[PDB]
Structure formats: C-alpha cells, structure tokens
Design a protein around this motif. Structure first.
Motif, PDB file in Angstrom:
ATOM      1  N   UNK A 180      73.823  49.462  67.614  1.00 46.52           N
ATOM      2  CA  UNK A 180      74.647  48.504  67.041  1.00 46.52           C
ATOM      3  C   UNK A 180      75.689  48.026  68.183  1.00 46.52           C
ATOM      4  N   UNK A 181      76.433  49.272  68.661  1.00 47.28           N
ATOM      5  CA  UNK A 181      77.270  48.906  69.697  1.00 47.28           C
ATOM      6  C   UNK A 181      76.690  48.165  70.986  1.00 47.28           C
ATOM      7  N   UNK A 182      75.533  48.369  71.146  1.00 48.50           N
ATOM      8  CA  UNK A 182      75.001  47.855  72.255  1.00 48.50           C
ATOM      9  C   UNK A 182      74.845  46.244  72.105  1.00 48.50           C
ATOM     10  N   UNK A 183      74.657  45.819  70.645  1.00 45.00           N
ATOM     11  CA  UNK A 183      74.117  44.496  70.634  1.00 45.00           C
ATOM     12  C   UNK A 183      75.148  43.388  70.482  1.00 45.00           C
ATOM     13  N   UNK A 184      75.228  42.665  71.317  1.00 39.46           N
ATOM     14  CA  UNK A 184      76.458  41.621  71.591  1.00 39.46           C
ATOM     15  C   UNK A 184      76.335  40.853  70.364  1.00 39.46           C
ATOM     16  N   UNK A 185      75.281  40.186  69.866  1.00 39.91           N
ATOM     17  CA  UNK A 185      75.252  39.168  68.869  1.00 39.91           C
ATOM     18  C   UNK A 185      76.257  39.754  67.812  1.00 39.91           C
ATOM     19  N   UNK A 186      76.601  40.968  67.488  1.00 35.43           N
ATOM     20  CA  UNK A 186      77.237  41.408  66.374  1.00 35.43           C
ATOM     21  C   UNK A 186      78.793  41.366  66.840  1.00 35.43           C
ATOM     22  N   UNK A 187      79.135  41.085  68.062  1.00 39.49           N
ATOM     23  CA  UNK A 187      80.635  41.011  68.567  1.00 39.49           C
ATOM     24  C   UNK A 187      80.841  39.815  69.378  1.00 39.49           C
ATOM     25  N   UNK A 188      79.968  38.835  69.657  1.00 35.02           N
ATOM     26  CA  UNK A 188      80.324  37.975  70.506  1.00 35.02           C
ATOM     27  C   UNK A 188      80.307  36.680  69.554  1.00 35.02           C
ATOM     28  N   UNK A 189      81.364  36.539  68.904  1.00 36.70           N
ATOM     29  CA  UNK A 189      81.722  35.440  68.115  1.00 36.70           C
ATOM     30  C   UNK A 189      83.124  34.930  68.238  1.00 36.70           C
ATOM     31  N   UNK A 190      83.491  33.607  67.771  1.00 36.86           N
ATOM     32  CA  UNK A 190      84.580  33.002  67.643  1.00 36.86           C
ATOM     33  C   UNK A 190      85.253  33.261  66.678  1.00 36.86           C
ATOM     34  N   UNK A 191      86.236  34.214  66.221  1.00 34.92           N
ATOM     35  CA  UNK A 191      86.916  34.519  65.379  1.00 34.92           C
ATOM     36  C   UNK A 191      87.793  33.458  64.572  1.00 34.92           C
ATOM     37  N   UNK A 192      87.694  33.424  63.365  1.00 33.21           N
ATOM     38  CA  UNK A 192      88.456  32.533  62.557  1.00 33.21           C
ATOM     39  C   UNK A 192      89.081  33.423  61.385  1.00 33.21           C
ATOM     40  N   UNK A 230      79.285  34.102  54.741  1.00 34.10           N
ATOM     41  CA  UNK A 230      77.863  33.711  54.447  1.00 34.10           C
ATOM     42  C   UNK A 230      77.019  34.995  54.093  1.00 34.10           C
ATOM     43  N   UNK A 231      77.027  36.004  54.910  1.00 37.18           N
ATOM     44  CA  UNK A 231      76.265  37.070  54.375  1.00 37.18           C
ATOM     45  C   UNK A 231      76.753  37.782  53.080  1.00 37.18           C
ATOM     46  N   UNK A 232      77.722  37.580  52.505  1.00 36.89           N
ATOM     47  CA  UNK A 232      78.095  38.046  51.332  1.00 36.89           C
ATOM     48  C   UNK A 232      77.736  37.489  50.218  1.00 36.89           C
ATOM     49  N   UNK A 233      77.048  36.233  50.459  1.00 37.39           N
ATOM     50  CA  UNK A 233      76.380  35.576  49.431  1.00 37.39           C
ATOM     51  C   UNK A 233      75.156  35.558  49.267  1.00 37.39           C
ATOM     52  N   UNK A 262      70.268  38.172  61.240  1.00 31.87           N
ATOM     53  CA  UNK A 262      70.393  39.496  61.895  1.00 31.87           C
ATOM     54  C   UNK A 262      71.535  40.277  61.424  1.00 31.87           C
ATOM     55  N   UNK A 263      72.737  39.473  61.188  1.00 33.53           N
ATOM     56  CA  UNK A 263      73.908  40.176  60.436  1.00 33.53           C
ATOM     57  C   UNK A 263      73.594  40.565  59.306  1.00 33.53           C
ATOM     58  N   UNK A 264      73.025  39.729  58.423  1.00 34.97           N
ATOM     59  CA  UNK A 264      72.867  40.083  57.093  1.00 34.97           C
ATOM     60  C   UNK A 264      72.060  41.518  56.890  1.00 34.97           C
ATOM     61  N   UNK A 265      70.907  41.581  57.731  1.00 34.80           N
ATOM     62  CA  UNK A 265      69.964  42.520  57.851  1.00 34.80           C
ATOM     63  C   UNK A 265      70.710  43.792  58.356  1.00 34.80           C
ATOM     64  N   UNK A 266      71.839  43.769  59.208  1.00 30.26           N
ATOM     65  CA  UNK A 266      72.681  44.989  59.766  1.00 30.26           C
ATOM     66  C   UNK A 266      73.721  45.441  58.644  1.00 30.26           C
ATOM     67  N   UNK A 267      74.296  44.390  58.182  1.00 33.24           N
ATOM     68  CA  UNK A 267      75.390  44.958  57.104  1.00 33.24           C
ATOM     69  C   UNK A 267      74.638  45.614  55.882  1.00 33.24           C
ATOM     70  N   UNK A 268      73.378  45.141  55.667  1.00 35.40           N
ATOM     71  CA  UNK A 268      72.648  45.827  54.816  1.00 35.40           C
ATOM     72  C   UNK A 268      72.289  47.496  54.944  1.00 35.40           C
ATOM     73  N   UNK A 269      71.711  47.407  56.136  1.00 32.80           N
ATOM     74  CA  UNK A 269      71.543  48.983  56.576  1.00 32.80           C
ATOM     75  C   UNK A 269      72.945  49.599  56.591  1.00 32.80           C
TER      76      UNK A 269
END
Ligand SMILES: NC(=O)Cn1cc(-c2c(Cl)cnc3[nH]ccc23)nn1
Length: 297
Positions: A180-192, A230-233, A262-269
C-alpha cells in the motif's frame, strides 16, 4: 468507554444551560463514539463515550458551525455545546433534529425507479458541493494525512500481532502494508472536505416526499480523499450496490471510476486491520478476533 444515566445527562445540560428546561428525554441512538439523546422531541444531544469520541464531537461541532448553511441538503445545526473537561475536549453537544428515516438499501430498492435516480442525483450534488467547499481555513487537526495513518497503524499492528502471528503469517502482513505505502494512487489525491462516514444510515429520507432530506453524523468529517465519500456507499451487503453508486458517480462527473474501485478494494481488505486496532482500542473482543481470522488467509 463510559456511560451515563439519564439524570447525569440532564444535570450536565442544566449546568451549562440553566434557562433550558427539559421535559422529554430518550436515548435516540448509540454509536461507537457517542450516545445520542432526543430532548424535547426536537434536539439530539451527543454525549461521548471516551476521549477519542469527544474530539470527534468537538470536530463535528466545529465543522458544522463552519459549513452552516452551505450545503444543498439539511444538516444538523449546533444549538448547545458542552465544555472541555479532564481528558474530554467536549463533554457534549446539542444539535437540531433532522426529520426523516434512514435511506436503507431495502428502502431504496423499494422506491420507484424515478425516485432512485433522484436520490443519486441528490447525493451527487450534496457531495459535489461538500467537496468544493474551500478548506484553506481549517486547522491541521482536521486534515487526514493518509500516509502517516497507514504508518501509525503499521506500527500498532506490529506490536499487537507480535504476540499473535510470527514470521510466515506476518511477512504476508508486511508485504501488505509496504504494498500500500508504495502505491501512489492511494495518496496522490486533491484533498477536500469529506463526510468520511457517508453511508445509508446517515442519509435521512422523507418517505412522503420520496426524497432525501437530511445528512447527519459529521463526527468523522475531515480533509481527505473525496473518493472516501463514495467507497463507503459500496459494500453490496450492508450498503448500496455498485449499480446505485455508479449512478451517483456519473451525476458527479467523476472522471476515474477504476480508481474508486481500486480504493474500495483496498479499504475492504484493510478493514480487518482496522478491526484489530479498534478491536484492541475500545475493547471489542469480537472485533479483534474477527480481524485475526481474516488476516490468517
Ligand atoms: N449516535 C448518533 O447517531 C449521533 N447522531 C445523531 C444524529 C442526528 C442528529 Cl445530530 C440530529 N437529528 C437527527 N435525526 C436523525 C439522526 C440525527 N446524527 N448522528
């Protein structure tokens, strides 16, 4: 955690609000963080069970006051607030009661097809406004850095499972965090600003008007990934489907649904590692042991 008699709630409210005479008081809800009380049929009073929950109640108040009147769906208005105490940032808070029952997956799947498509439209506009709220005036105590969360957890998990796994079972765990820590897609977001607990039981519904009329529980709201709302729905079992959520993402003009999944699958595990941390944090034995089995697989 802790707990309060009715008389304890009333005396805490009277103390800080001596002109406010209470007539009716019921237990409305009981979450992990707070007990909610309905007072005079018109107010919900959150009382924290533990220090972690009172800073969620502090932050909820602060976030509601600051987004007051900005959103296209009714949200609680802060009317009463308690005081910081020993280990409690906020002793309690009273909000306006939002009418409506939760929009459960059963409730929704029983609605007409029109009203289902309206519900997704309404949630899209709500999350679209919420996410476009300018967040330059919040303090760092409201921002969810994901990386450090992953890292604090990761250390927590090494001490908890140390006396529980060993080598082979663990090294699979290590391969899971570092992956996970390697994978940017989990961290390269625009926070809001995100709700962070955006699920069926926090969306209030008007079965007469057949429309959504309420969003509640901002106790986890933060600055963070908007894909979180969105993943929480998604969840199929306990939430809506990818069928309904996808209609929400399309009214929202979300331009990358594959990384929502991808994020849904990761929060699931990852949920199994949250069970171990919270399972061991609050005292939920079953949450700990339900986190362990899932790992060992
Ligand atoms: N333990 C908890 O569920 C805390 N809680 C209560 C509410 C809430 C509030 Cl504040 C006011 N009007 C409402 N109407 C229905 C729910 C609701 N949302 N979160």
């Amino acid at each position: 955690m802790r707990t309060y008699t009715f008389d304890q709630v009333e005396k805490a409210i009277e103390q800080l609000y001596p002109d406010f005479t209470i007539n009716t008081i019921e237990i409305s809800g009981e979450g992990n963080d707070c007990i909610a009380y309905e007072i005079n049929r018109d107010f919900i009073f959150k009382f924290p069970k533990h220090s972690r929950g009172s800073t969620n109640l502090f932050n909820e108040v602060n976030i509601l006051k600051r987004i007051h009147n900005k959103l296209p769906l009714p949200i609680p208005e802060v009317v009463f607030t308690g005081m910081p105490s020993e280990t409690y940032q906020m002793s309690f808070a009273g909000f306006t009661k939002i009418k409506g029952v939760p929009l459960t997956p059963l409730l929704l799947n029983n609605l007409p097809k029109q009203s289902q498509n309206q519900a997704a439209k309404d949630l899209a506009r709500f999350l679209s406004e919420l996410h476009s709220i300018n967040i330059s005036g919040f303090k760092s105590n409201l921002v969810l850095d994901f990386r450090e969360k992953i890292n604090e957890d990761n250390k927590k998990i090494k001490k908890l499972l140390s006396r529980e796994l060993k080598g082979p079972q663990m090294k699979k765990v290590d391969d899971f965090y570092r992956d996970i820590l390697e994978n940017e897609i989990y961290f390269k977001y625009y926070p809001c600003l995100i709700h962070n607990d955006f699920s069926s039981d926090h969306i209030l519904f008007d079965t007469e008007k057949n429309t959504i009329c309420g969003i509640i529980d901002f106790g986890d709201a933060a600055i963070s990934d908007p894909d979180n709302d969105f993943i929480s729905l998604m969840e199929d079992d306990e939430e809506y489907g990818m069928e309904f959520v996808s209609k929400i993402l399309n009214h929202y003009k979300h331009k990358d649904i594959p990384t929502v999944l991808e994020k849904y699958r990761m929060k699931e595990k990852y949920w199994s590692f949250e069970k171990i941390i919270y399972g061991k944090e609050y005292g939920y034995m079953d949450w700990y042991e339900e986190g362990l089995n899932e790992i060992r697989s």
